[PDB]
Amino acid sequence: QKIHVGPGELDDYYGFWSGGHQGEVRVLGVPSMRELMRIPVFNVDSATGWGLTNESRHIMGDSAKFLNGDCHHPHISMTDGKYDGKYLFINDKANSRVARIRLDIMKCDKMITVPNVQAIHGLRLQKVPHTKYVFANAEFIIPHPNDGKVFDLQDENSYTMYNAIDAETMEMAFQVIVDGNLDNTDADYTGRFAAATCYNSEKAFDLGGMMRNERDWVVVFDIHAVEAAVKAGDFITLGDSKTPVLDGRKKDGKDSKFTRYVPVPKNPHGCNTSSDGKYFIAAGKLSPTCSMIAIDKLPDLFAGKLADPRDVIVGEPELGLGPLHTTFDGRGNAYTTLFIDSQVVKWNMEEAVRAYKGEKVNYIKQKLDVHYQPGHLHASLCETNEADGKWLVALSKFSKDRFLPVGPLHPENDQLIDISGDEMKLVHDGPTFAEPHDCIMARRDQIKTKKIWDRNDPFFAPTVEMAKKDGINLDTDNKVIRDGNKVRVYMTSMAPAFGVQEFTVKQGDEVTVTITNIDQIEDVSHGFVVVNHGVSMEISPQQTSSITFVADKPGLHWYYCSWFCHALHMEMVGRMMVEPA
Amino acid sequence: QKIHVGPGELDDYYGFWSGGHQGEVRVLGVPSMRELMRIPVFNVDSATGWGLTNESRHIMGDSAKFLNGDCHHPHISMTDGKYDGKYLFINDKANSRVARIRLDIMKCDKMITVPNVQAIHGLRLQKVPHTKYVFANAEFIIPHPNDGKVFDLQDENSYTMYNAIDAETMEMAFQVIVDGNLDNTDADYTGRFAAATCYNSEKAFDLGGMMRNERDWVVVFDIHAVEAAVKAGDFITLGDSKTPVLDGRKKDGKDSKFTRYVPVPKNPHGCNTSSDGKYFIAAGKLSPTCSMIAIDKLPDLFAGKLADPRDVIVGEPELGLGPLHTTFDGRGNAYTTLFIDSQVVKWNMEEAVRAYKGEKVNYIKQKLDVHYQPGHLHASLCETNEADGKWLVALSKFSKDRFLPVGPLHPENDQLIDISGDEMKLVHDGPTFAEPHDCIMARRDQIKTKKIWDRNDPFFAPTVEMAKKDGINLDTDNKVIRDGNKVRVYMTSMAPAFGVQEFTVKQGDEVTVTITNIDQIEDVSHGFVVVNHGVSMEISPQQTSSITFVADKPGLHWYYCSWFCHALHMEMVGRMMVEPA
Ligand code: CUA
Ligand code: CUA
Ligand SMILES: [Ca+2]
Ligand SMILES: [Ca+2]
Ligand SMILES: [Cl-]
Ligand SMILES: [Cl-]
Ligand SMILES: [K+]
Ligand SMILES: [K+]
């Protein structure tokens, strides 16, 4: 199978990698494993001015004050259990956010901070009938209200919540209070059920305490029952949030009608739905197993028709040491990372189910050594009913000697594995920065990208609205609007000249520069940097970008195009002249 | 030759890429072209906390307020015209800086704002007898003083300057005023001479006016004469800067002792010393030529033995449309980018010289089409007398259709070219983010990196010193020091436990957390992230890092390790508890 993409040739799949602790999203070509684009999300990017521009800061809201993020889980919007290629969503663990990327422009266009929670970790998407909800985990137990009066985790009102976000609006839709905590999550192929893993059912703060129970659980959610309760107006609110809050804890040994708790050993981690829709598969982590829950049996569990919640367990196969995550080939095989054994294990799901019933059978097909200590793994289209069993990426945490020494900080090793055959063949070691935990692959024909910006694009629609209030037509105009010590420069840009090449202001004036790239040629980006003022942004073809800064320094100050756009690029410059105070 | 590095195999060269206007430095393996490591410099890195930690902000001094940078020209220190692998230096055009990276730890350790200039662009290093000076071009003409009294570029005191920095101390060494401006620069193989290109001899501000005269110049500096005058006290200063400033402007048609101006067509760009040390070669940009200055002849120019400045020009080969940069194979051939023709032209230098002298020889050997619009190119070891003629990287600005569509903003195309034989051949297309401009390659055996940190490392020595004062032994202690409204947490970390797992502070306190990674095994890095507090940092084996922030939010606040360090990493957490107002 394939492997080398020589000059002129194109990759077959897009990869969307999390940037990890660095905070961005990265687009790669598969199987070349080359990075094609960096998508700034929670990081501040000097190149594009994400985190610096008015458009980007507006999307971020108040969280624009944070220079950091921590992502793990990129996921693509679906329709009928199939990628529709409209949206990618990703978590921020550091500052408790969920972000949307529009796959047509390859930019983050929505960002929300989840209210009344701490640490958005696990995140996956509703599959069916489509991605109406972004389900997202809040990992850490906190007091409610968190005012510094109560610190106890055991306190009745100390808990965390499972979060649902409207995918289209990017507003909270509801929250569910749970016992224990939440790690990872996934969703069924009907839209009625979602599940999440929990490693801290003990509600402990110390290391030994979190490991005390032999089993924790995966909590199952009846999303339909939840929605009906929100609709009937049976919910509460907390503090300053309008978000409907539902109670999915167990009261006095009896289930809330929103949730079921299926005990699972031990500090489980991964929570993955098989591509046939049959199973939620929890990776056992401290237990050398996966637990297979049958979605088939879930209606009966919620209709109180099953004696023990363990009855929905249909398979609990032994796999090896340190199972973290599971993916699928769409041929009936599951593939699990074993962190401690440092392997990917390939196993037949339906044979494990047989084994659980006592049938004598070898469900393990193969173990492949990886280098080293795999966390997540991802097989192409695994999260869809179209899982194609072609490629597998295993993202390993310790690269040791697999790449040249680069000092005491090492890269992660994301290894491309051929899975189209009976035998898994390691094909490529891919060094990556700042620990992408997980990734997702899409067919090339599943992604449709704008070649150039449309002038009515929502991304800078507010900046367009500001321009009309000024009677400024962005497509044509090159003017300076003055309003107190506010200065609003509006300009066209065209390789190799700025539409406005000089302007004068007073020391202390607040300057906003709005640039519209009127070039029609694809790939002709411009940039705008103001020297010694910490101002930098990108303006791609047919885009409008704006940036606000203070001219605290008197004198002549140069602004230049940062993007090489033309033979006379070095000369694409202008002058801001600041009068003394 | 080569091309493919498979699993378990290692690259043959280190590549060091400028991150462009993204702001960082990137480490690659050649010939795989894979990104092994990112070294944050002018960017804020959320992963390692560069820009957030006290160690980094201290290195950045006052400029730590800037979140942006624009880097172009990475260069490795040399000893007797050969790489010595101690430091890499890089410019920042956007905020007028020069950074130093220690190649043993792959971190930026020193950073200077260059006084009284605007935009540090061109940069190269003294070659022989070693890298004593870092030379850097300030590109834009500004008034002196720059206080908003004069804006006219034609004024007696409106000018830019050439800069010399002591490579070891990272202090200013001297500055030389020049006419016109400064684009790129290189140095000879003796230490006496340096050269720079100028494209704005007209001192205009508009596009047409910068293209006014058919020639500008390269300006040659006599570093020995400059050093002679500085120690003979003969220098001026500008404002509050101690930096010795010398005048290299032409007076009334008469030269200064420090410079000579050699007319060159037209808006010349790249300035490159050949590997035999015979030529400063300037790429012609608007002239379809390059210009060859015989370094041989510079002593007679400066001594007044030569009739006219053009006498040091021993070659002006016609090469094609829009020459930008030149590199060398160490076989007598030069390789020049043609931005307009989109080609690398390979040519024989000695033959070009003989063709300027009259002889009719075809000095052009080959033209290779590149994709598309190349800027810089770099041949392996080209800046040393060991130029090995094996690899060539042409860094092109328009990727067009060469990679998968990823939206309106396109990657750059950095193309690996095999030049070890007689014919240049294109072997690999490497997509890169944010316009890397230039890059430098080094033999594997030229770089030596630390596997773990030394406890006594200068990088965090100030933090060690501060620890003494509080009475703290960093290798062992887990303490909290109260000092008014300032709390100073010291802790060791050892997978998978923080040394301090909870602390309590009062609303409003200034909390400094200092972490020392006492793990002994390589690659066992830890992280530190305070949830919803914009706090994030790396701590690698044997390192001490510190971050300061304001606990302004009452309640329970989780901190967690961001770097996957152990099987129980998810559980490597801690609590900050904040006592109400
Ligand atoms: Cu616009 Cu370079
Ligand atoms: Cu320490 Cu993860
Ligand atoms: Ca547990
Ligand atoms: Ca000129
Ligand atoms: Cl998962
Ligand atoms: Cl150059
Ligand atoms: K690591
Ligand atoms: K480009």
The Cα B298–Cα A576 span in angstroms is: 39
Coil, helix or strand at residue B268: coil
Give contacts of B94 with chain A, Cβ < 8 Å: 46, 529, 531, 536, 562
- In angstroms, the separation between the Cα of residue A328 and the nearest Cα of chain B is 23
* Alpha carbon of A535 to ligand 2 centroid (Å): 35
The Cα A234–Cα A230 span in angstroms is: 6
Alpha-carbon radius of gyration of chain B: 26
CB distance A385 to A81 below 8 Å: yes
Sequence-distant (6+) residues with CB within 8 A of B169 are none
Nearest to B210 among A409, A411, A571 (CB): A571
Sequence-distant (6+) residues with CB within 8 A of A487 are A480, A481, A503, A505, A509, A510, A511, A512
CB distance B295 to B280 below 8 Å: yes
- Would strands A510-517 and A486-494 be described as parallel, antiparallel, or unpaired? parallel
For testing contact with chain B, the best of A14, A55, A68 (most B CBs within 10 A): A68
Q: Tokens 């893993």 — which residue?
A: A197
B497 pocket-lining for ligand 2 (C-beta < 6 Å): no
Give contacts of B107 with chain A, Cβ < 8 Å: 407
The Cα B16–Cα A374 span in angstroms is: 28
Q: Which atom of ligand 2 is nearest to the CA of B526?
A: 1
- Kindly determine whether residue A7 and residue B95, on different chains, have CB atoms separated by under 8 Å: no
DSSP state of A352: H
For testing contact with chain B, the best of A38, A152, A570 (most B CBs within 10 A): A570
* Residue type at position B202: E
* Residue type at position B344: V
- Would strands A245-247 and A172-178 be described as parallel, antiparallel, or unpaired? parallel
Residue nearest to atom 1 of ligand 2 (CA): B526
The Cα A377–Cα A93 span in angstroms is: 20
The Cα A547–Cα A512 span in angstroms is: 6
Q: Which helix (H) or strand (E) holds A228?
A: helix A223-231
Dihedral of the alpha carbons of B141, B146, B147, B150, in degrees to the nearest 10: -50
CB distance B139 to B117 below 8 Å: no
B146 Rama sector, left if φ>0, alpha if ψ -120 to 50, beta otherwise: beta
- Would strands B535-539 and B216-222 be described as parallel, antiparallel, or unpaired? unpaired
Q: Which atom of ligand 1 is nearest to the CA of A563?
A: 2
- Kindly determine whether residue A529 and residue B68, on different chains, have CB atoms separated by under 8 Å: yes
Q: How was this structure determined?
A: X-ray
Sequence-distant (6+) residues with CB within 8 A of A536 are A46, A47, A49, A52, A527, A528, A529, A562, B21, B68, B70, B94
* Alpha carbon of A94 to ligand 3 centroid (Å): 22
3-class secondary structure per residue, B159-214: EEEEEEEECCCCCEEEEEEECCCCCCEEECCCCCEEEEEECCCCCCCCCHHHHCCC
Q: Tokens 């002994």 — which residue?
A: B520
Name the nearest CA neighbour of A93 among A124, A68, A120, A73: A120
Name the nearest CA neighbour of B548 among B580, B521, B509: B509
Burial class (CB in 10 A: 0-12, 13-18, 19+), B435: buried
Both tokens of B399, joined, read 């990727």
CB distance A142 to A160 below 8 Å: yes
CB distance B116 to B44 below 8 Å: no
The Cα B533–Cα B555 span in angstroms is: 13
Question: Which residues are A518's β-sheet partners?
Answer: none
Residues 367-386 on B with a CB inside 8 Å of A are 371, 373, 375
Name the nearest CA neighbour of A10 among A25, A28, A37: A28
* Residue type at position A557: H
Q: Is B569 annotated as a binding residue?
A: yes
Looking at chain B, the number of H-run helices and the number of E-run strands are 5, 40
Whether A302 contacts chain B with CB within 8 A: no
- Give the count of alpha carbons within 13 A of B380, CB side only: 21
Nearest residue of A to residue B579, measured between CA atoms: A148
Indicate the length of chain B as a whole number.
581
Cis (ω within 30 of 0) for the bond into A266? yes
Q: Which helix (H) or strand (E) holds A469?
A: helix A461-469
Residues 272-291 on B with a CB inside 8 Å of A are 285-286
The Cα B261–Cα B216 span in angstroms is: 9
Name the nearest CA neighbour of A90 among A80, A102, A79: A102
CB distance A102 to A153 below 8 Å: no
CB distance A280 to A290 below 8 Å: no
Burial class (CB in 10 A: 0-12, 13-18, 19+), B304: exposed
Coil, helix or strand at residue B547: strand
- In angstroms, the separation between the Cα of residue B16 and the nearest Cα of chain A is 11
The Cα B372–Cα B378 span in angstroms is: 16
Sequence-distant (6+) residues with CB within 8 A of A430 are A33, A393, A413, A414, A415, A416, B34
- Give the count of alpha carbons within 13 A of A128, CB side only: 18
CB distance B46 to A69 below 8 Å: yes
- Give the count of alpha carbons within 13 A of B91, CB side only: 28
- Kindly determine whether residue B403 and residue A52, on different chains, have CB atoms separated by under 8 Å: no
- Kindly determine whether residue B106 and residue A409, on different chains, have CB atoms separated by under 8 Å: yes
Burial class (CB in 10 A: 0-12, 13-18, 19+), B83: buried
* Alpha carbon of A389 to ligand 6 centroid (Å): 49
Alpha helices in B272-348 (DSSP H): 298-302
The Cα B214–Cα B192 span in angstroms is: 30
Nearest to A142 among B4, B7, B556 (CB): B556
Give contacts of A38 with chain B, Cβ < 8 Å: 22, 433-434
Q: Which atom of ligand 2 is nearest to the CA of B527?
A: 1
Question: Which residues are A344's β-sheet partners?
Answer: A337, A368
- Would strands A193-198 and A172-178 be described as parallel, antiparallel, or unpaired? unpaired
The Cα B510–Cα B484 span in angstroms is: 9
The Cα B103–Cα B100 span in angstroms is: 9
* Residue type at position A426: L
Rounded to whole angstroms, what are the CA distances from B463 to A59, A220, B188, B530, B537? Answer: 37, 49, 40, 20, 15
* Alpha carbon of A261 to ligand 3 centroid (Å): 14
A572 pocket-lining for ligand 1 (C-beta < 6 Å): yes
Both tokens of B178, joined, read 């020049």
The Cα B81–Cα B53 span in angstroms is: 37
The Cα B421–Cα B452 span in angstroms is: 40
Q: Is B350 annotated as a binding residue?
A: no
CB distance B180 to B158 below 8 Å: no
* Alpha carbon of B516 to ligand 2 centroid (Å): 13
CB distance A551 to A532 below 8 Å: no
- Kindly determine whether residue A36 and residue B140, on different chains, have CB atoms separated by under 8 Å: no
CB distance A159 to A143 below 8 Å: no
Dihedral of the alpha carbons of A49, A54, A55, A60, in degrees to the nearest 10: 90
What's the farthest any 2 CA atoms get from each other in chain B?
Answer: 88
The Cα A404–Cα A312 span in angstroms is: 48
Whether A208 contacts chain B with CB within 8 A: no
- Kindly determine whether residue A523 and residue B562, on different chains, have CB atoms separated by under 8 Å: no
Coil, helix or strand at residue B479: strand
Rounded to whole angstroms, what are the CA distances from B202 to A29, A332, A450, A559, B157? Answer: 46, 73, 42, 19, 15
Q: Tokens 């004062």 — which residue?
A: B469
DSSP A355-408: HHTT-----EEEEEE-SS-EEEEEETTTTSTT----EEEEEES--TTSS---SS
Whether A207 contacts chain B with CB within 8 A: yes
Q: Tokens 């029952």 — which residue?
A: A225
Give contacts of A397 with chain B, Cβ < 8 Å: 564
Name the nearest CA neighbour of B133 among B178, B172, B90: B172
Rounded to whole angstroms, what are the CA distances from A81 to A16, A189, A261, A276? Answer: 19, 6, 25, 10
A344 pocket-lining for ligand 1 (C-beta < 6 Å): no
Alpha-carbon radius of gyration of chain A: 26
- In angstroms, the separation between the Cα of residue A502 and the nearest Cα of chain B is 9
Put the strands of the sheet holding A323-328 in their side by side order: A323-328, A333-338, A343-348, A364-369
The Cα A41–Cα A110 span in angstroms is: 10
Q: Which atom of ligand 2 is nearest to the CA of B498?
A: 1
Name the nearest CA neighbour of A95 among A71, A79, A73, A127: A71
Angle at B130 between CA B127 and CA B133, to 5 degrees: 80
CB distance A74 to A92 below 8 Å: no
CB distance A131 to A123 below 8 Å: no
Give contacts of A573 with chain B, Cβ < 8 Å: 140, 205
Coil, helix or strand at residue B464: helix
Nearest residue of B to residue A266, measured between CA atoms: B568
- Kindly determine whether residue A23 and residue B35, on different chains, have CB atoms separated by under 8 Å: no
Residues 447-476 on A with a CB inside 8 Å of B are 447, 449-453
Cis (ω within 30 of 0) for the bond into B31? yes
Q: Tokens 């966390």 — which residue?
A: A375
Nearest to A406 among B36, B48, B428 (CB): B36
Residues 395-414 on A with a CB inside 8 Å of B are 397-400, 402-411
Both tokens of B52, joined, read 């957030």
The Cα B41–Cα A316 span in angstroms is: 49
Coil, helix or strand at residue A547: strand
CB distance A152 to A195 below 8 Å: no
Both tokens of A60, joined, read 């971020």
DSSP state of B118: S
Beta carbon pairs, A and B, within 8 Å: 401
The Cα A510–Cα B141 span in angstroms is: 24
The Cα B325–Cα A231 span in angstroms is: 67
Q: Which atom of ligand 1 is nearest to the CA of A524?
A: 1
Whether B525 contacts chain A with CB within 8 A: yes
The Cα A32–Cα A28 span in angstroms is: 8
- Would strands A573-579 and B425-432 be described as parallel, antiparallel, or unpaired? unpaired
Helix, strand, coil % over all residues of chain B, rounded to 5: 10, 40, 50
Residues 3-62 on B with a CB inside 8 Å of A are 4, 6-8, 10-11, 14, 20-23, 27, 29, 33-38, 42-49, 51-52
Residues 552-581 on A with a CB inside 8 Å of B are 554-558, 560, 562-565, 567-568, 570-575, 577-580
- Give the count of alpha carbons within 13 A of B480, CB side only: 15
A322 Rama sector, left if φ>0, alpha if ψ -120 to 50, beta otherwise: left
Domains and CATH numbers, chain A: 1-460 (2.130.10.10), 461-580 (2.60.40.420)
Phi, psi for B354 (deg, rounded to 5): -70, -25
